[PDB]
Design a protein around this nucleic acid. Structure first.
Ligand SMILES: [K+]
Ligand SMILES: [Mg+2]
Length: 97
RNA sequence: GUUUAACAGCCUGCCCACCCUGGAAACGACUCAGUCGGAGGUAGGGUCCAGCGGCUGGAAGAGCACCGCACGUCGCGUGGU
């Protein structure tokens, strides 16, 4: 399940939550996978997709809104998008492709 | 009774709004009340907006108060604080 893998990444991996940090990781090429929620504004989603295409980074469309993504990440706030800098014990980067 | 107009310049910069750095749970900030924050808070530094705000020019030469000299019939006279 995507949620279980995300929880495993949260408890054992490196990540950044938020649009600005996601763009920073994409610019720095440190991010390896970008997750975008349905709630994400269309323009922001398009910009993130363009950045990921430029950086050759996979993009996954989370099956939920920002509230659901934040809940899956274990946080009490909304998460519009997140970047997986390093999956510790998970294999999302390997399973998704 | 012990005053300072329009207008010109400089300064200031309410409550908001906005920008840059950064990335937050042991959640924090915060109002009389609320509310705000990974759609980026707290924090640090800035931009802008109001003013019937400040200083200067206008403008002390004016106005007001007080104290005097003089013509003493007609100087709307003359001086000081
Ligand atoms: K006027
Ligand atoms: Mg005088």
């Amino acid at each position: 399940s995507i949620n279980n893998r995300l929880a495993l990444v949260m408890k054992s991996g490196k990540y950044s939550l938020g649009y600005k940090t996601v763009l920073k990781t994409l610019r720095s090429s440190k991010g390896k996978l970008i997750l975008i929620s349905n709630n994400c504004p269309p323009l922001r989603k398009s910009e993130i997709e363009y950045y990921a295409m430029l950086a050759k980074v996979g993009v996954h469309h989370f099956n939920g809104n920002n509230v659901d993504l934040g809940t899956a990440c274990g946080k009490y706030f909304r998460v519009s998008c997140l970047s997986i800098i390093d999956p510790g014990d998970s294999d999302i980067i390997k399973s998704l492709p």
